[PDB]
Design a protein around this ligand. Sequence first.
Ligand SMILES: [Cl-]
Ligand SMILES: [Fe+3]
Ligand SMILES: [Fe+3]
Ligand SMILES: [K+]
Length: 298
Amino acid sequence: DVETRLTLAREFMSGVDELPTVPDIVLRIAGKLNDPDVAIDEVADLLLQDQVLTARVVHLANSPLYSAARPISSIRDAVIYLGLDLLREAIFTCAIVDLFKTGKGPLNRSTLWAHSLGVARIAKLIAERTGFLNPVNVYVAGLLHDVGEVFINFFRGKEFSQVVTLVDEEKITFGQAEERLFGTSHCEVGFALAKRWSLNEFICDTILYHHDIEAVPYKQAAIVAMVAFADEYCTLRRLGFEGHKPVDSVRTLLENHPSWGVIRRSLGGSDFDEKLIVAELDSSIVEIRAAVDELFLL
Ligand SMILES: [Cl-]
Ligand SMILES: [Fe+3]
Ligand SMILES: [Fe+3]
Ligand SMILES: [K+]
């Protein structure tokens, strides 16, 4: 009954007069992720007129995670030092942050952003460790995964207020509370939204299926599997808000997570040890959380 939930999701957006938008640069970048031979200076040139976006990009570029110890002070430095993929990634991040800032609701702006940035970054780490060829695509799917909660929070806040208090009082997940109160969730709303924005279906499906990887109706589902894992990981390691049923052992859950099999079926040649990946994440999650929390203050 996804169409029932998808129909309800579209009706839920109908009642909003002015719907959120994303910059053309976000859609442009989203569209070009698979083209290895784009000219870096063309990408760089997109920032030229935008002093605010430019300064944001130089700031993220200079962060340890992007730069290491090398000082990035101009955009010219960022171009030379980041290269095409990390530059697309940094620009995407610095432009999409306006979506997460431009509103208020019952959940704090910073809650949704920090969780989304965490998911993006962890999902990318997984992409890298499992040999996935275009990890920026996983990053972008990750950062957008909960764009539906952003919508409900900012645009149907009066209503989301009730989701929050049902969650806080009966200790169910946001997705469960949404299902009960609205008959649809941020998965379906986020899908409807991303479809309205003309985002590729690899992103749309990640938004739709990220709370149950086992629902994806096709075999090559690496990105979704990566972001679903990253979301559950973040939620279980203090980088989230959506809630989770009680777990006997988190490490064991993460080690046995269904995404690992989905990634292996999608990437026939990839050899990885999910035990060591979970261990690595756990060893760096305090640092990851610090970096996330510090980048932009929303
Ligand atoms: Cl739809
Ligand atoms: Fe979610
Ligand atoms: Fe999430
Ligand atoms: K503020």
